[PDB]
Ligand binder design. Structure first.
Ligand code: B12
Ligand SMILES: C[C@H]1O[C@@H](n2cnc3c(N)ncnc32)[C@H](O)[C@H]1O
Ligand SMILES: *Cc1c(COP(=O)(O)O)cnc(C)c1O
Lengths: 727, 109
């Protein structure tokens, strides 16, 4: 129900009744192609069906405020520790075109040996429980019916509790998940046996729910000493996980590779990534690509990150990408803030729309150098396979340290993470199934003797108990909370207040954080500390320098800073005061013509001022169709009023620069009198300007308007079409 | 070194190379699919129970007692079930009950 595009999101109301909540939709959804689409004045080649409500890129104001949507599903990461502030960020994310919410889990939830209940405050991620998945999956259900396009909720099914979370995800309509047996082994040191048997059950559940599945290979670039050498390991890992998911029972169209452009500038990044991207696309035809933006080789400059992402985005365009996960341009600087999440989304929208139709104009030179490197990668991937095999399959190679080796395979340095096949977390919890083993549930991978009870049920083991929780949502137990301190209700109270007081925030409600940017004419170490002082004297709390860039070792240093503003403000106190566009102005001088006489008057030779608000270059009033009879400089005030009637003009525009002895205010009073005297003061606009003119002082001379330092044709044309109307 | 290890692939067509790739894949994982078919783990069994309508809490009670009984092999949801039909009560009752020592002797027979 509801959600008005102008009423904030009702978090407290949403958390109301998380026991009666069941999901509208299920499984994954792609974007619907909108072939040859007409938006604003343009035709789009690679666009998807538009949103019914959104925020267009700022530059669209010049185009009718159109917001084209690209073909790839665009992903935004979202987790702060409190899933409540994160719902507001999701509504934000949606309007800016994102349709894939990915939710990271509190650090190491992977090691949790079971679900957890309720909604604790998490650490560098949201903790994943049922209350929280229902709250977010319920909010997205409004937000989605709002922007007018389905949104995929997405998370992680990893570590010793694989099958639980997966099961919970299916009960509660999560649309996709990361899941890779090997993330578990290689990176979380979880027993490789335990782990690979967990993933069988996991994936089976997930195939049952039509969920999208993303793998863990990107984590390879993270650990690589030099990412551009980890290519053979990458294809291999991708391939094991793909083939594994395929034989469990998932659909190739539901299996996604998680591929990241290897390197970043000053690296010749395009020339190193394009072969890998192309080889990867060749080798895994029929599978989905989820393109992720680089995060390894990334520093503190939002700009530097943003530019690299555009290049990353290019690779996707010159190849393929069914999903396009974005990275917050601030990732290397701090925890993603609301704004930088919107930045990433607008960037990808901006770049993909920008290169709409590109592959109609450009192609890859698939022979030549490109085609050769592609071969070299494939051959190395293949050799790597055989090395694995000729050592006795996966479990062995891992023990013998083939993975996370810092070399370019064949090359092996002997520093990969080596796991014990008898070791790791949960070693010795694998139990041999018995001939009489049984499970009366749906989506069970392993060997299951339902036959010793009823043949007719082999394919429907759940009949044994009249439906498990996949058939019968009503059999699901919903635990609300286990802790009565660390919980969402307690966290709502902490900030109950702000819900007419107002303060800045970056991630959590009312955290009073703001970004401060300056430049200081000194060395880097010093300017760092100098900027702290400035920062404090502006009453900032908990100050941190979050980025130093050198300009020149001596000349200066750019500094970003976050700091907390230790106070609120009130709307109800704000002093808020309740203009014609260039086109109205033009449409007015269009229908009724406007003739002007303009001159620098007196003995004044300063001509540039008046030429400036007249000449078309800087938006002077030639721009709008005004007819201007320039008399030149040093024109006697009589001679100007004479010309005005000679040429049956509508306005005199006199300029007056020299201002010694008030000569500029006098020259005006004399224009007004020469005008009154000659019986035309009432049917002619007299307007004047000059560096030393104060509008109001000039109006007291008897001229309809004055113009000072920094005026432009727009102001002059405006005054001319407005004042004219009066008369 | 790589110049020699790549010799026996040098002849393969780009698509034979591809073929070779994916069958070595299938060859690497099948043994893993097997382990998966004939074994069980604690997390797997919790998830059967979760499916049978237990909480994550209750479920790590049944499973944690089921390991102390060497009963894992039979499947924690098969115990719950045959104990259910034996004392002819509900699934949620025989289960609720197994969470605190009740009906484990009967079970073991
Ligand atoms: C370059 C210059 C000259 C040039 C001008 C060349 C030319 N063709 O214009 C020449 C012409 C080289 C010159 C001459 C002199 N000038 Co001189 N000139 C300057 C200087 C540096 C340029 C200012 C300027 O051009 N502004 C740039 C324009 C774009 O801005 P603007 O004039 O302010 O116009 C803006 C607004 O006024 C407004 N506007 C202006 N008029 C109108 C009219 C209308 C209808 C509207 C809507 C808006 C509008 O729109 C413009 C913004 O887009 C200034 C110093 C200064 N920094 O102001 C003096 C300065 C104004 N001139 C000065 C002096 C003293 C002189 C001389 C008397 C000295 C001398 N050389 O012997 C001579 C005599 C001039 C004469 N014979 O009449 C003094 C001012 C004296 C005074 N207080 O009265 C100044 C301030 C320099 C100084 N500090 O001494 N100089
Ligand atoms: C320290 C933590 O353990 C969990 N937790 C698990 N069981 C309980 C319980 N019976 N009471 C309170 N918290 C519990 C939390 O929800 C958590 O934050
Ligand atoms: C923009 C531009 C200028 C601007 O300088 P002005 O002296 O103010 O006219 C000059 N020449 C060219 C060719 C330009 O494009």
């Amino acid at each position: 129900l509801q959600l008005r595009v102008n009423e904030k999101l009702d978090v407290e109301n949403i958390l109301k009744d998380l026991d009666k909540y069941t999901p509208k939709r299920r499984g994954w959804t792609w974007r619907q192609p909108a072939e040859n689409l007409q938006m604003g004045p343009f035709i789009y080649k690679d666009a998807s069906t538009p949103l019914e409500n959104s925020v267009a890129l700022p530059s669209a104001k010049y185009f009718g405020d159109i917001d084209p949507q690209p073909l790839p599903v665009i992903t935004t990461e979202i987790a702060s520790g409190r899933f409540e502030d994160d719902i507001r960020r999701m509504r934000m994310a949606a309007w800016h075109g994102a349709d894939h919410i990915m939710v990271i889990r509190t650090a190491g939830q992977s090691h949790y040996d079971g679900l957890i209940e309720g909604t604790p405050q998490g650490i560098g991620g949201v903790p994943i429980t049922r209350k929280q998945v229902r709250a977010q999956r319920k909010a997205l259900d409004l937000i989605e019916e709002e922007v007018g396009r389905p949104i995929n909720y997405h998370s992680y099914v990893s570590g010793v509790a694989g099958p639980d979370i997966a099961v919970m995800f299916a009960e509660e309509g999560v649309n996709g998940a990361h899941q890779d047996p090997q993330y578990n082994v290689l990176y979380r040191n979880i027993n490789m046996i335990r782990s690979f048997i967990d993933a069988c059950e996991s994936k089976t559940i997930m195939a049952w729910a039509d969920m999208a599945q993303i793998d863990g290979a990107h984590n390879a670039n993270a650990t690589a000493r030099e990412a551009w050498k980890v290519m053979p390991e990458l294809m291999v890992q991708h391939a094991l996980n793909s083939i594994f998911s395929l034989k469990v029972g998932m659909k190739k169209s539901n299996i996604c590779l998680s591929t990241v452009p290897p390197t970043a500038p000053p690296a010749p990044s395009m020339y190193l990534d394009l072969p890998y991207a192309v080889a990867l696309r060749e080798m895994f035809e029929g599978y989905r690509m989820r393109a992720q933006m680089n995060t390894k080789y990334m520093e503190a400059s939002t700009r530097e990150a943003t530019v690299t992402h555009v290049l990353n985005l290019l690779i996707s365009k010159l190849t393929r990408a069914d999903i396009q996960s974005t990275i917050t341009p601030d990732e290397g600087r701090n925890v993603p803030w609301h704004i930088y999440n919107i930045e990433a989304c607008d960037t990808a929208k901006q770049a993909l729309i920008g290169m709409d139709g590109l592959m109609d104009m450009v192609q890859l030179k698939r022979e030549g150098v490109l085609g050769d490197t592609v071969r070299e990668l494939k051959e190395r991937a293949v050799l790597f396979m055989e090395e694995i095999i000729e050592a006795g399959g996966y479990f062995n190679a891992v023990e013998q340290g083939f993975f996370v080796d810092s070399g370019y395979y064949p090359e092996r340095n002997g520093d990969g993470i080596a796991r014990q096949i008898n070791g790791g977390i949960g070693a010795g919890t694998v139990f041999e199934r018995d001939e009489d083993y049984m499970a009366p549930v749906t989506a069970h991978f392993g060997y299951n003797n339902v036959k010793q009870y009823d043949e007719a049920l082999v394919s429907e083991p759940s009949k044994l108990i009249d439906g498990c929780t996949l058939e019968v949502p009503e059999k699901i137990v919903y635990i609300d909370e286990l802790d009565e301190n660390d919980n969402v209700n307690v966290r709502m109270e902490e900030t109950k207040e702000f819900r007419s007081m107002i303060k800045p925030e970056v991630e959590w409600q009312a955290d009073g954080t703001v970004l401060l940017t300056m430049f200081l004419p000194t060395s880097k170490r010093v300017a760092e500390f100098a900027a702290i002082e400035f920062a404090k004297k502006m009453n900032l709390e908990e100050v941190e320098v979050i980025n130093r860039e050198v300009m020149q070792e001596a000349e200066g240093t750019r500094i970003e800073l976050k700091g907390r503003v230790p106070f609120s403000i009130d709307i109800n106190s704000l002093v808020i005061p309740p203009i014609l566009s260039e086109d109205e102005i033009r449409e007015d001088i269009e229908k009724t013509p406007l003739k002007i006489v303009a001159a620098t008057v007196g003995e004044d030779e300063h001509s540039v001022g008046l030429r400036e608000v007249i000449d078309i270059k800087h938006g002077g009033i030639e721009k709008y169709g005004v007819e201007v009879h320039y008399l030149g400089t040093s024109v006697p005030v009589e001679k100007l009023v004479d010309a005005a009637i000679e040429l049956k003009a509508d306005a005199i525009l006199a300029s007056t620069i020299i201002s010694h002895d008030d000569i500029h205010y006098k020259n005006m009073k004399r224009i007004h009198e020469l005008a009154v005297e000659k019986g035309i003061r009432d049917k002619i606009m007299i307007g004047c300007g000059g560096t030393q003119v104060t509008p109001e002082v000039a109006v007291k001379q008897g001229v309809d308007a004055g113009f000072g330092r920094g005026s432009k044709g727009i102001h002059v044309a405006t005054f001319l079409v407005k004042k004219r109307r009066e008369m | 070194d790589f110049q020699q290890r790549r010799a026996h692939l040098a002849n393969l067509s780009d698509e034979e190379l591809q073929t070779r790739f994916w069958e070595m894949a299938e060859k690497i994982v099948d043994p893993l699919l097997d382990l998966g078919k004939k074994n069980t783990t604690p997390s797997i069994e919790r998830s059967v129970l979760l499916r049978m309508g237990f909480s994550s809490l209750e479920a790590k009670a049944i499973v944690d007692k089921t390991m102390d009984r060497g009963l894992m092999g039979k499947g924690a949801g098969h115990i719950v079930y045959k104990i259910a039909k034996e004392k002819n009560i509900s699934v949620r009752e025989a289960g609720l009950a197994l969470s605190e020592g009740k009906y484990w002797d009967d079970a073991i027979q």
